[PDB]
Design a protein around this nucleic acid. Structure first.
Ligand code: BRG
Ligand code: CA
Length: 314
DNA sequence: GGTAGACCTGGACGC
DNA sequence: GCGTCCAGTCTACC
């Protein structure tokens, strides 16, 4: 009853709502689609994960997003805590206004969007977002998900346990920069990225100026932010774009990967024109990004999130 | 300035 | 049951 993961039905008094129609958000289309890797549908239509250093379970009805938080006396999320959720899902951004616009200038988008509504971008923590995507390169979402879980279990603060699940906060820079981290990460199965994580944490803490340097890029320009991130080991064009779009408030950033290349070729008959290469390469990937920006506008990265999410569900 | 190949690690084929 | 193919970043040499 009071044990295990909560469900809206089981612990009624332990849930607070926030107005949000499925047209503004679809948990099942945002949480497991490769933006954040820390949410799990422990119970049908109920997603659990760490949000703002606390564990939460979320579920939705046609017009409501139901939230419950596990902190001592179990109580309802307060108005402030709920505000943290609104911020995570960037709810001030009207997804219906964006879909209308993109669909107005892109007939193919209008078509896909008609069946994949509620795909918006999570506003993530720079650090969590940075190392999670360092683990993403040349990998698949399912594997990346386990790597990130083992990484947080081994180096992150222990939060609380529900059923046989112990939740952990994302490791700090100091922890990731500690001694022998790479070796431990390799036993955890991160492959060659184990080096990127260790090397990137130290680089940030010992050469770039620490956490302030990262949290800073958020006020800088996409052009600025993207160049800086590429300095870090394991952070190429894609990873840096994912970070700019999902954690540094650069909504025009467009991560270019195998999925976006397939979407470009199959749904737009796109081809590189300013570059000599016929396939993926540093030059062609940059062109594709510009292409999608030119097509969708200022919030091109968000539109990209819709097609990418839709391309996974296949 | 612009490419071939190696990288870790499993699922998903295909024979 | 096995050898490939897949889901980006970094460097050789150009
Ligand atoms: N373009 C793109 N590539 C990605 N890889 C991962 Br893993 N997640 C994403 C994403 O949201 N967009
Ligand atoms: Ca590939």
């Amino acid at each position: 009853g009071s044990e295990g993961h909560r469900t809206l039905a089981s612990t009624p008094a332990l849930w607070a709502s926030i107005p949000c129609p499925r047209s503004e958000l679809r948990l099942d289309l945002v949480l497991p689609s490769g933006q954040s890797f820390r949410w799990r549908e422990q119970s049908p239509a109920h997603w659990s994960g760490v949000l703002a250093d606390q564990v939460w379970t979320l579920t939705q009805t046609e017009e409501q997003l139901h939230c419950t938080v596990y902190r001592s006396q179990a109580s309802r999320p307060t108005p402030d805590e709920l505000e943290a959720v609104r911020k995570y899902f960037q709810l001030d951004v009207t997804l219906a206004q964006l879909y209308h616009h993109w669909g107005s200038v892109d007939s193919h988008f209008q078509e896909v969007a008609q069946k994949f509504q509620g795909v918006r971008l999570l506003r993530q923590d720079p650090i969590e977002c940075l190392f999670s995507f360092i683990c993403s390169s040349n990998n698949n979402i399912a594997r990346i998900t386990g790597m990130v879980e083992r990484l947080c279990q081994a180096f992150g603060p222990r939060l609380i346990q529900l059923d046989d699940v112990t939740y952990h906060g994302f490791p700090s820079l100091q922890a990731l920069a500690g001694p022998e981290v790479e070796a431990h990460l390799r036993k955890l199965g991160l492959g060659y990225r184990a080096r990127y994580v260790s090397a990137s944490a130290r680089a940030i803490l010992e050469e770039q100026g620490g956490l302030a340097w990262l949290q800073q890029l958020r006020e800088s320009s996409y052009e600025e932010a993207h160049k800086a991130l590429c300095i870090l080991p394991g952070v190429g064009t894609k990873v840096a774009d994912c970070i700019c779009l999902m954690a540094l408030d650069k909504p025009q950033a467009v991560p270019v990967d195998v999925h976006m290349w397939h979407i470009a070729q199959r749904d737009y008959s796109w081809h590189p024109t300013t570059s000599q290469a016929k396939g993926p390469s540093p030059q062609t990937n940059k062109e594709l990004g510009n292409f999608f920006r030119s097509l969708w506008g200022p919030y091109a990265g968000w539109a990209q999130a819709v097609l990418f999410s839709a391309d996974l569900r296949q």
